[PDB]
Amino acid sequence: QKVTFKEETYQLEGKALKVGDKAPDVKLVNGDLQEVNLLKQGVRFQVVSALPSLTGSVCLLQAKHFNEQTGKLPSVSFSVISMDLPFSQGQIAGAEGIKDLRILSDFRYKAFGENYGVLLGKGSLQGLLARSVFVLDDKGVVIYKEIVQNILEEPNYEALLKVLK
Ligand SMILES: *c1nc(C)n(CCO)c1N
Numbered sequence: 001q002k003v004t005f006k007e008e009t010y011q012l013e014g015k016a017l018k019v020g021d022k023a024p025d026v027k028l029v030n031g032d033l034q035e036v037n038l039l040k041q042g043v044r045f046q047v048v049s050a051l052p053s054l055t056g057s058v059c060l061l062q063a064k065h066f067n068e069q070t071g072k073l074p075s076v077s078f079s080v081i082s083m084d085l086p087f088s089q090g091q092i093a094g095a096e097g098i099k100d101l102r103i104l105s106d107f108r109y110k111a112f113g114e115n116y117g118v119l120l121g122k123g124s125l126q127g128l129l130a131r132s133v134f135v136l137d138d139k140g141v142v143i144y145k146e147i148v149q150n151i152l153e154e155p156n157y158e159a160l161l162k163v164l165k
């Protein structure tokens, strides 16, 4: 699978993950510099959205709304991952008026990038995460997987919402 950024084309680094595969539980760092496991204990629908950069991203703007709608749904969690440090993530998020959003950094181990196969290879965005969304069940099996072909574009909104019906 190839991802594009203006005149650049990326080979995705890490292990390829398919619908039906058990996604591995990975270590990430939260806004309190606490190490957390990606997979929430018991939650039936786990949305995991990965961004190259939180800074001025479309996902950050709609994060507060989507987090509300998912929160009210039964057993649906919403996690946003980037290579951004937690401090920057906390201030970016805080500045947009997004409270209690599970924004997590992959900076320490690059465990999400490597295990979900979305670590961008050689190029200007090398070592950043490809724009991607996963839905995992309580068991960590991949219900839905989308990796955007154009890193600047957003995942299919329709297709994501339909999975949460
Ligand atoms: C970030 N990434 C995704 C897929 N979302 C949900 C739609 O806005 C956000 N907020």
Ligand code: NA
Binding pocket: 133, 146, 155, 156, 157, 159, 160
């Ligand atoms: Na999608």
